[PDB]
Amino acid sequence: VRSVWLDAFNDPVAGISAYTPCVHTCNLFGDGENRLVIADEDRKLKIWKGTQKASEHPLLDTPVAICSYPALAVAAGSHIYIYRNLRPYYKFVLPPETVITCMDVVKQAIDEPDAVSCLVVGTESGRILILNPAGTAIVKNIWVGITPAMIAVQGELDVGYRITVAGRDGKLYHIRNGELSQTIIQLEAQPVGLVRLAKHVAVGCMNDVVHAYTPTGHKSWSLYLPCHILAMQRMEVTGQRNTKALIVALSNGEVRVYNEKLLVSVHVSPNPVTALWFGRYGREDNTLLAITKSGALDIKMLPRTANLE
Amino acid sequence: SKKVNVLVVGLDNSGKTTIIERLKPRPRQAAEVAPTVGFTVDEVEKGPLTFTVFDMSGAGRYRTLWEQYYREADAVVFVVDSADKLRMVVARDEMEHMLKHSNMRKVPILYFANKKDLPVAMPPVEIAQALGLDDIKDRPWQIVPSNGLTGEGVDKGIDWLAERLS
Numbered sequence A: 001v002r003s004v005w006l007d008a009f010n011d012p013v014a015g016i017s018a019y020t021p022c023v024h025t026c027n028l029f030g031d032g033e034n035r036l037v038i039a040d041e042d043r044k045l046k047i048w049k050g051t052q053k054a055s056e057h058p059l060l061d062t063p064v065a066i067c068s069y070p071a072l073a074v075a076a077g078s079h080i081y082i083y084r085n086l087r088p089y090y091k092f093v094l095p096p097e098t099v100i101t102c103m104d105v106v107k108q109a110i111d112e113p114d115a116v117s118c119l120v121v122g123t124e125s126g127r128i129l130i131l132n133p134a135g136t137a138i139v140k141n142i143w144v145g146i147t148p149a150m151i152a153v154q155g156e157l158d159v160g161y162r163i164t165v166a167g168r169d170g171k172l173y174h175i176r177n178g179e180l181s182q183t184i185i186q187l188e189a190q191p192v193g194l195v196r197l198a199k200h201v202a203v204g205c206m207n208d209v210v211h212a213y214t215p216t217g218h219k220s221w222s223l224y225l226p227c228h229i230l231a232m233q234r235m236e237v238t239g240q241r242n243t244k245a246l247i248v249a250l251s252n253g254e255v256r257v258y259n260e261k262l263l264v265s266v267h268v269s270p271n272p273v274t275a276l277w278f279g280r281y282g283r284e285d286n287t288l289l290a291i292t293k294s295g296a297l298d299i300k301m302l303p304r305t306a307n308l309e
Numbered sequence B: 001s002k003k004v005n006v007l008v009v010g011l012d013n014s015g016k017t018t019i020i021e022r023l024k025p026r027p028r029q030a031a032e033v034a035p036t037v038g039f040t041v042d043e044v045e046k047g048p049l050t051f052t053v054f055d056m057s058g059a060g061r062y063r064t065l066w067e068q069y070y071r072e073a074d075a076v077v078f079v080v081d082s083a084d085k086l087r088m089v090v091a092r093d094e095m096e097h098m099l100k101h102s103n104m105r106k107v108p109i110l111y112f113a114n115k116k117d118l119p120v121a122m123p124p125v126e127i128a129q130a131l132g133l134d135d136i137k138d139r140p141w142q143i144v145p146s147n148g149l150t151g152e153g154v155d156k157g158i159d160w161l162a163e164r165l166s
């Protein structure tokens, strides 16, 4: 309908050039006020706190993606430089001769925020590796045929956890509780993004349609989009409102918020948004961080009283 | 004396709790002040007026509680961390929701542009722009930059409020 968001703050002339996977926020400095972490194309790692840049850093390689388990962990080539707090700590590397395509996190026990967490890596070889809560050691190795293009982890490592895997061959594979499922989905075109929602996974195929999929395979809904999908991201509001939304940014410049099937908010950023992050940044819990193609940093925040119903 | 209700609201970490301590007697003051939990009723005397001061949390979770005190409030102290440019709009929104609420009467609002002492602090005039104080035209209001650690300006403010309260 209209835009649900509050316009926090904007820097058009930030120097940021990253797509969704290289952007992240966490509590690096433990002091509650979270920081923005970006593995820029500058082969530089810029760090934002609040509304101005804190530090820049030099990066060995141009980076695939960064996550956190806290310790920022950049992946590029075959190394994964685990910095921590925030100074170098490890250079864990894949055992056989492998290159990393995507990386995400799994909650070990609590399934709560700021819990024990274990890094999860996809290799072009075709394995998905789950590591020690320290990061020191490879815990699970599940081999699956296709090249991983992007992945979504939903659950907890001890209780029960599922990983949905977007293969470059335009197919969706599922892994429930360490065991690799036999249910495989034939996507319509090549996958562009993959989000974990409430009761199912959402893929954005290149032909501008978001599909919602049950691990069983059922096609819940489909979102047919006026333009091209540039970025997709999970928007998880906790509280009384408790919704697991989907954010899509399109090359026409609009960013849309879908509550399951239903469109809840749309706004249009001056330039096409190439990276989307929603989480706690600063001292607000529900913040939309956007990185435009023009390198701008746009920050928005969901009002306390907004409905997404 | 004359008893009045002062509601002290404002985002979390703004220095609501600290600003009230600088109204407490020098020996009565606290060393470290901790993130307020739920809310606190305190008391302060100032001249012929005795302030019954409600210090609320500004945390996300607790923001729901301020409305519980709107009906009774006779004056409101709104606190803004002048260095926290980021969450400014949020403070505006909450401020608006308060003023809009059909329980918050047209009572005096004193805005503390607290933490004036920080390097990155926003100037009183640039803040009243963000929260849009210029549009508030039915109530006595006043912005006053403060340093709650020291109590710098706290007096300047409370004195203003008490002037409206007589």
Ligand SMILES: Nc1nc2c(ncn2[C@@H]2O[C@H](COP(=O)(O)OP(=O)(O)OP(=O)(O)O)[C@@H](O)[C@H]2O)c(=O)[nH]1
Pocket (backbone or CB within 6 Å): B011, B012, B013, B014, B015, B016, B017, B018, B019, B033, B034, B035, B036, B037, B056, B057, B058, B059, B079, B114, B115, B116, B117, B118, B146, B147, B148, B149
């Ligand atoms: N530099 C500076 N620091 C301050 C100032 N006022 C408070 N602080 C400190 O910054 C933090 C703010 O804490 P509080 O005063 O408890 O924040 P609050 O407004 O009471 O909000 P709650 O979290 O709901 O209790 C504490 O470390 C304060 O003591 C100030 O004027 N200048």
Ligand SMILES: [Mg+2]
Pocket (backbone or CB within 6 Å): B016, B017, B018, B035, B036, B055, B056, B057, B058
């Ligand atoms: Mg307080």
Ligand SMILES: [Pb+2]
Pocket (backbone or CB within 6 Å): A017, A018, A019, A022, A039, A040, A041, A063, A064
């Ligand atoms: Pb990058």
Ligand SMILES: [Pb+2]
Pocket (backbone or CB within 6 Å): A021, A023, A024, A065, A066, A067, A068
């Ligand atoms: Pb990440």
Ligand SMILES: [Pb+2]
Pocket (backbone or CB within 6 Å): A188, A189, A203, A204, A205, A206, A207, A208, A209, A210, A211
């Ligand atoms: Pb599709």
Ligand SMILES: [Pb+2]
Pocket (backbone or CB within 6 Å): B155, B156, B159
């Ligand atoms: Pb005085």
